[PDB]
Design an enzyme around this catalytic site. Structure first.
Site, PDB file in Angstrom:
ATOM      1  N   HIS A   1       0.795  -1.217   0.000  1.00 29.49           N
ATOM      2  CA  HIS A   1       0.000   0.000   0.000  1.00 29.49           C
ATOM      3  C   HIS A   1       0.832   1.274   0.000  1.00 29.49           C
ATOM      4  CE1 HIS A   1      -4.042  -1.485   0.128  1.00 29.49           C
ATOM      5  NE2 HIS A   1      -3.856  -2.184   1.230  1.00 29.49           N
TER       6      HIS A   1
HETATM    7 ZN   LIG Z   1      -4.907  -5.501   3.132  1.00 29.43          ZN
END
Ligand SMILES: [Zn+2]
Ligand SMILES: [K+]
Ligand SMILES: [K+]
Ligand SMILES: [Zn+2]
Ligand SMILES: [Zn+2]
Ligand SMILES: [Zn+2]
Ligand SMILES: [Zn+2]
Lengths: 353, 385, 5, 30, 183
Positions: free
Chosen positions: B150
């Site tokens: 992320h």
């Molecule tokens: Zn995740």
């Protein structure tokens, strides 16, 4: 050591009787590791070394929240970028910070006869631009602001509304969710994602019949002795046409951001790719939107800004019919004669050999 | 072109014997994000104990990759962000209030303790893991402390501060022409898709839940720009997907990718928040419906690199990772757990199985027909490797 | 928004 | 001869009036 | 109270600009290709040949010089949205670094001049001018507005920063939006 942790009590303490009552009814082989791991430094980059008042709780300029530099004389507070000129939050000059207005007051010593004096002298000096003299003198007495359109400009377009913090909204904003504050509370596992209950989402609320999907022409209500046959009907936010989630290949219910728009509205912006832009205006209501009905029907162009009757051009279905057929017919015959002339030129060029 | 299938058990391939390498640093488990945040590097310790009590250490080599330096981290991230990460601490945080808003490191991702060291461990493990795959000298490379898919180039998002999958893929690209990255988390691998969005040398393929779900990216129509157009595959699904449905969606897409792209190396991110009974996920997979993806990716027989990921319940993730490593070593492990240090987390059955719910599945056959037809139509244009 | 805490 | 039938078929098959209006607006834009 | 008439096309231009700098998170591309000085110089140099009497020319030149001075003195104070003050700060920094003061008329385009024009009536009604002078200013501004409407197709194109290039607007990163708005 006596300080409570996540468990409710000190760490060196067993459970209380209340917890144990309401919670009750009545050699290993990873000793190793420091023997088998051997370091890896096989990587390629191992060469790299590597009046006792208080100030307001909002900015005086943008009227929002954050970390403010405050003024001592007056209860105003400003963001750091919302000043003139913006201040660095690290290198802040300590000492007495005053705003523009209080600094102007202390400069004139709160005496407006001196204001008479200085403004008269100022207007005498700025003889070149005498029209903008007094204006050019008032700018120095105001604390900064941010720009917001005058209200006689926003109200020319009625589909335009000022948001919460002075933001733009144009009727495509769904709405904030009010009983979705009621949603954080909810009815138990009766979700706002619309799962597990679709008997009454296929039934027209007011009339009483079923919502029939536009593409497949069925309301697959399933049967709730076999709930794996339902098909998650949803209606458009503009024309209220119902569609299945599997027909418009969406996999979601639009709940928060904007309104979902059926595939049955034309554009609102084109990008012709030839590249050019819009053929669609804005809605200038206030009853200043004037219409025109052209006296010639089969050739008028005028915009992509028509209105269909049984500046906005009033046009009827017959002229649209004729214009469509005319365009396709003449484009057909023109491209065919172009191919004809190209191929005949080809034949005289090839027989030329 | 979707068709329903059953779910037959997992049987290992006797021919595919791969020299697996396992990376574990005995210090990573001691750094805790906060009281009550759902991220625990403890779940990597738990797993390891299981792996060591089943006797899986006699089958593979165990290493401890030397940790990444501030200048191997900046192969992807910027110098200012890495300097902030290296300097910040929970006490001097009030002095960095302008970079806590620029780099997003204050509250969703907090500053807790030894953050730089956790990031160093992750990155070093994965870059080193990928570097041993290039030097000819492994076949699979397992590293569960990685998988922070992320983090962006100059921002943290989603409890992730350093993107080490990108460092590993950069280290892989020095010897392999084409690389494939498969992401079976319940979220979208937005950082890895952003970092390689305009290149035709890395092909990202992610199966995720799309809706009003974090991070809100990854629609069917995100296929890349520039020279890397049609080299990014997003498969969005609905809640409650199960093992047979996930299998019938996963296997055809991946077989088509491998037939047309023909990758030289794979990177499979096997984060386990797509299991049943998670704190943030909404899927209904079991342990074996989660390890079947790993077995299928291992089927094809090219250098592979398995990294960790999400997973918010510690026992489910620990057991699934142990089982996956076991079947990577060509054994199916017993279902009765052995006596280990964290024996009491695994009640009340004390077995190696994760149970699904009776949750309702909403992924119809026609939706998956449409999705797979679009995906194959796109992939038709990536053939000539 | 974001992921929980 | 047959194009009258085409436009009548479209008007019938759309079924609605607002949808037919949007259809005519698409045709005009083109 | 004072009243100014703005063509509806320029009103829609202003509403579009309000939509961009607000929930589209775009800023302007600076330094602009056509700045305030260039617009006002072209306007004055084109109109000064129109009417013969010297008084019209004196009034025109005085209006243009005053508009330049006033935009310079007003831009940072009142003419910027909240997202665009980080841009103002960065320009101020890179100017003070080169020992040169910032001069906003040679950087900012015509949309900020349009903002100033639109906000002019309230600034006029907040002072203590005459009434003859207010109506003279409003007349001059309405003439400038009709001239600018004749050229609106030259200063206010739509070009999609996301598509090709060199539009009048540019996209902002999450670091700019984090330090500008949410700081
Ligand atoms: Zn995740
Ligand atoms: K995923
Ligand atoms: K790519
Ligand atoms: Zn402010
Ligand atoms: Zn003050
Ligand atoms: Zn349907
Ligand atoms: Zn609709």
């Amino acid at each position: 050591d006596s300080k409570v942790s996540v468990t409710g009590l000190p760490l060196n303490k067993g459970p209380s009787e209340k917890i144990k009552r309401e919670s009750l009814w009545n050699d290993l082989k990873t000793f190793l590791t420091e023997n088998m791991t051997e370091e890896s430094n096989i990587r390629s980059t191992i060469g790299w070394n590597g009046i006792d008042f208080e100030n307001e709780d909002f900015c005086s300029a943008c009227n929002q929240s954050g970390s403010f530099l405050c003024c001592d004389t007056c209860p105003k507070s400003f963001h750091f970028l919302c000043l003139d000129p913006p201040i660095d939050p690290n290198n802040l000059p300590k000492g007495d910070w005053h705003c523009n207005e209080c600094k102007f007051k202390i400069f004139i010593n709160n005496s407006m006869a001196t204001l008479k004096k200085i403004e008269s002298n100022f207007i005498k000096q700025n003889n070149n631009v005498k029209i903008f003299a007094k204006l050019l003198f008032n700018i120095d007495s105001h604390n900064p602001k941010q720009f917001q359109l005058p209200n006689y400009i926003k109200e020319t377009f009625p589909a335009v509304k000022t948001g919460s913090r002075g933001q733009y909204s144009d009727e495509n904003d769904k709405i904030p969710l009010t009983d979705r504050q009621l949603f954080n509370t909810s009815y138990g596992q009766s979700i706002t994602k619309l799962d597990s209950y679709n008997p009454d989402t296929h039934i027209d609320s007011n009339s009483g019949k079923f919502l029939i999907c536009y593409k497949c022409n069925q309301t697959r209500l399933g049967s709730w002795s076999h709930p794996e046959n339902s098909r998650l009907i949803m209606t458009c936010d503009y024309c209220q046409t119902p569609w299945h989630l599997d027909c418009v290949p969406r996999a979601s219910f639009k709940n928060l951001g904007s309104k979902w728009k059926c595939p049955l509205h034309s554009p609102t912006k084109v990008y012709k790719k030839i590249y050019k832009v819009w053929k669609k205006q804005r809605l200038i209501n206030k009853k200043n939107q004037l219409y025109y009905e052209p006296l010639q029907k089969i050739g008028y162009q005028n915009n992509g800004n028509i209105q269909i009757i049984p500046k906005i051009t009033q046009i009827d279905e017959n002229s649209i019919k004729y214009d469509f057929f005319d365009k396709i017919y003449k484009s057909k015959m023109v491209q065919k004669r172009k191919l004809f002339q190209f191929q005949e030129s080809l034949i005289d060029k090839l027989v030329s050999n | 072109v979707y068709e329903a299938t059953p779910f037959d058990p997992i049987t290992v391939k006797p021919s595919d014997k791969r020299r697996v390498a396992y990376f574990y640093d005995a210090d990573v488990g001691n750094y805790a994000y906060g009281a009550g945040h759902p991220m625990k590097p403890h779940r990597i310790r738990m797993a390891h104990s299981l792996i060591m009590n089943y006797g899986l250490y006699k089958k593979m080599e165990i290493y401890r990759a030397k940790p990444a330096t501030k200048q191997e981290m900046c192969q992807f991230h910027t110098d200012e962000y890495i300097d902030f990460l290296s300097r910040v601490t929970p006490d001097n945080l009030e002095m960095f209030k302008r970079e806590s808003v620029k780099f997003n490191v204050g509250d969703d991702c907090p500053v807790f303790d030894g953050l730089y060291e956790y990031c160093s461990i992750s990155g070093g493990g994965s870059m080193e893991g990928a570097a041993r795959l290039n030097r000819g000298k492994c076949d699979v490379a397992v590293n569960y402390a990685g998988g922070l898919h992320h983090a962006k180039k100059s921002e943290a998002s989603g409890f992730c501060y350093l993107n080490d999958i990108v460092l590993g893929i950069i280290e892989l690209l020095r010897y392999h022409p084409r690389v494939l990255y498969i992401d079976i988390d319940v979220h979208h691998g937005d950082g890895v898709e952003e970092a390689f969005y305009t290149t035709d040398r890395v092909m990202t393929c992610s199966f995720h839940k799309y809706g009003e779900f974090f991070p809100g990216t990854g629609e069917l129509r995100d296929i890349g720009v520039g020279a890397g157009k049609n080299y990014a595959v997003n498969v969005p699904l609905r809640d409650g997907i199960d093992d047979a449905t996930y299998r019938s969606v996963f296997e055809p897409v991946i077989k088509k990718i491998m037939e047309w792209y023909q990758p030289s190396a794979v990177v499979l991110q096997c984060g386990g928040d797509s299991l049943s009974g998670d704190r943030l996920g909404c899927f209904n997979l079991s342990m074996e419906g989660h390890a079947n993806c790993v077995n299928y990716v291992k089927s094809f027989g090219i250098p592979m690199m398995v990294v960790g990921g999400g997973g918010y319940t510690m026992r489910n993730v620990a057991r699934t990772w142990c089982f996956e490593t076991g079947l990577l070593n060509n054994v199916v492990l017993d279902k009765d757990l052995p006596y280990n240090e964290y024996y009491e987390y695994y009640g009340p059955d004390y077995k190696l199985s994760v149970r699904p719910s009776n949750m309702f599945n909403v992924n119809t056959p026609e939706y998956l027909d449409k999705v797979m037809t679009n995906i194959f139509a796109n992939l038709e244009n990536t053939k000539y490797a | 928004x974001x992921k929980x805490x | 001869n047959e194009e009258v039938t085409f436009f009548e078929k479209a008007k019938r098959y759309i079924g609605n009036k607002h949808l037919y209006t949007e259809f005519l607006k698409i045709l005009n834009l083109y | 109270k004072i009243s100014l008439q703005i063509p509806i096309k320029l009103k829609s231009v202003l509403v579009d600009d309000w939509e961009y700098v607000t929930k589209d998170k775009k800023i302007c591309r600076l330094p602009a290709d056509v700045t305030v000085e260039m617009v006002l110089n072209k306007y004055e140099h084109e109109v000064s040949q129109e009417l013969e009497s010297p008084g019209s020319q004196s009034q025109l030149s005085e209006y243009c010089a005053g508009l330049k001075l006033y935009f310079d003195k007003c831009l940072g104070n009142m003419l910027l949205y909240r997202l665009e003050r980080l841009q103002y700060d960065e320009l101020l920094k890179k100017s003070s670094k080169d020992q040169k003061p910032l001069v906003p008329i040679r950087i900012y385009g015509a949309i900020h001049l349009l903002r100033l024009i639109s906000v002019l009536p309230e600034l006029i009604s907040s002072t203590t001018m005459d009434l003859q002078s207010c109506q003279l200013l409003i007349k001059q501004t309405e003439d400038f507005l009709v001239w600018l409407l004749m050229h609106v197709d030259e200063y206010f194109n739509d070009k999609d920063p996301n598509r090709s290039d060199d539009a009048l607007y540019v996209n902002t990163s999450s670091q700019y939006e984090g330090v500008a708005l949410g700081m």
